[PDB]
C-alpha cells in the first residue's frame, strides 16, 4: 500500500479536483456491482452520509472471511490490504480496486454476512485495528463498505457532490442491466434509482 | 511498513507507558553515533524542541543520497521506508519526520508523514560541511497518555553512551525550558 500512499494521483486520479475523490466511490461501487452479480435481488444502495462518508451495500455473496493460506489472515483482509483492458463494465479499473481506497481513507469499516454469520472489521489508513471478527447471526448475505476519505489526501474539493455520483451510476445501470442502483442523501433526503 | 503499523508495540515496545516513546529517540541516537563514529570530530546533537519533536544532528559522511537500482529512489529512501529495530521503525510511527543530509558538497532535504514521503529527496542547497538530521514527531495515533519527552530519562541515556562511546562528542539541548548538557568521554 506504501506505493499509492507514495502517489495517490496515479492510482485513484486527480486528488485536488474532485476525479480522486468520486473515483474513490467508484471503486467501492466496481466491487459492489461484481459481487451483486449473484444474488436474490441483485441491488446495491450507495449512500452518501451527513459526516461526509459513503456506504455502499451489496447483496451478494460477501466477500470469503477464511484465512488466506500464504497470508495468513482473512481472504477479506487480503482483499482489503494487498496490491485498453484496464476497463470494467462494473466501472472500476483493473490494478486499482478496493485495497487503494482503503490506503487512502481515514476509516473503512466493512461488514460481510456470509454463512449465517456477521463479520465486522475496522481499518484506519489502510491499517487494521483488529482481525476480521465473527459479531452475530444473520439469514441474509452481503458486504458493506462504508469509508471515511483521508482529508491529507484529498484536498480543496473534499465534499461529496451527488450529480456527479448519480451521473455515473446512471451509465452503470445500462452497462449493469440486471443490477438495482439505488443512491441516497442524508445530508439533504434526496434519492434516485437506476434500474435498466 | 505495513508490518509495523499493523501491530507498533511488537517493535517499538510499550505505547502506553513512554518506554516505547524514548525508545524512538535512543534508536536515532544509535544510528547517529555510529554516523559520527566515521568523520574526526565525531559530534552529535540532541535537541527536545518546543512542539515536542527531537532531533538528532551528526556530523558523519551523510546517509547515501543516490538512486538505489532496484527501487528506482534515493538509497535515503530506501533506509527510510524499508524494514536494533531500524530508523524505518523510528519514521512509520512518527506523524511527521524531517531528513536533512550533507554530501557531496549538497544539502539534501525530505520530509515523511507517517512514513510516507510527500515529494522526493531534493537538493536545496550547498555546503561544506558533511552529516545527517533526523527530526521526527511522535505519532499521537500510536503513542498514549505519556506524549511528552523526558528530559532525565535522555539525559542519563546518553551520558552511559558516552563512556561506552570514546571520543564522541554528546550535546543535548530542551528548548522547552533552556537546559543543557555536554557528555564527551575522551579516554583510552
Ligand atoms: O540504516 C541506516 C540508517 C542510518 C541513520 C539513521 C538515522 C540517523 O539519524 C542517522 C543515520 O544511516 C545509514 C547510513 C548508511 O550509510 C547506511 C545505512 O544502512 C544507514
Ligand atoms: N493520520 C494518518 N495518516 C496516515 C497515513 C498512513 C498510515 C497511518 C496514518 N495516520
Excluded at 469509508?147 to 461529496?160: A, G, H, K, M
Aim: net charge negative.
Amino acid at each position: 500500500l506504501d506505493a499509492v500512499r507514495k502517489r495517490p494521483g496515479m492510482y485513484i486520479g486527480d486528488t485536488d479536483d474532485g476525479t480522486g475523490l468520486h473515483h474513490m466511490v467508484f471503486e467501492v461501487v466496481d466491487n459492489a456491482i461484481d459481487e451483486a452479480l449473484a444474488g436474490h435481488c441483485k441491488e446495491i444502495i450507495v449512500t452518501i452520509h451527513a459526516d461526509n462518508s459513503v456506504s455502499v451495500q451489496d447483496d451478494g455473496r460477501g466477500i470469503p472471511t477464511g484465512i488466506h493460506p500464504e497470508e495468513g489472515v482473512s481472504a477479506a483482509e487480503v482483499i482489503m490490504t494487498v496490491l485498453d483492458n484496464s476497463y470494467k463494465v462494473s466501472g472500476g479499473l483493473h490494478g486499482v480496486g478496493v485495497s487503494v481506497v482503503n490506503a487512502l481513507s481515514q476509516k473503512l469499516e466493512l461488514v460481510i454476512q456470509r454463512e449465517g454469520k456477521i463479520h465486522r472489521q475496522i481499518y484506519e489508513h489502510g491499517v487494521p485495528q483488529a482481525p476480521l471478527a465473527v459479531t452475530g447471526e444473520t439469514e441474509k448475505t452481503g458486504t458493506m463498505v462504508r469509508f471515511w476519505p483521508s482529508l491529507e489526501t484529498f484536498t480543496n474539493v473534499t465534499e461529496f457532490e451527488y450529480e456527479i455520483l448519480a451521473k455515473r451510476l446512471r451509465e452503470l445501470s445500462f452497462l449493469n442491466s440486471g443490477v438495482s442502483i439505488r443512491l441516497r442523501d442524508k445530508r439533504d433526503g434526496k434519492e434516485d434509482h437506476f434500474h435498466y
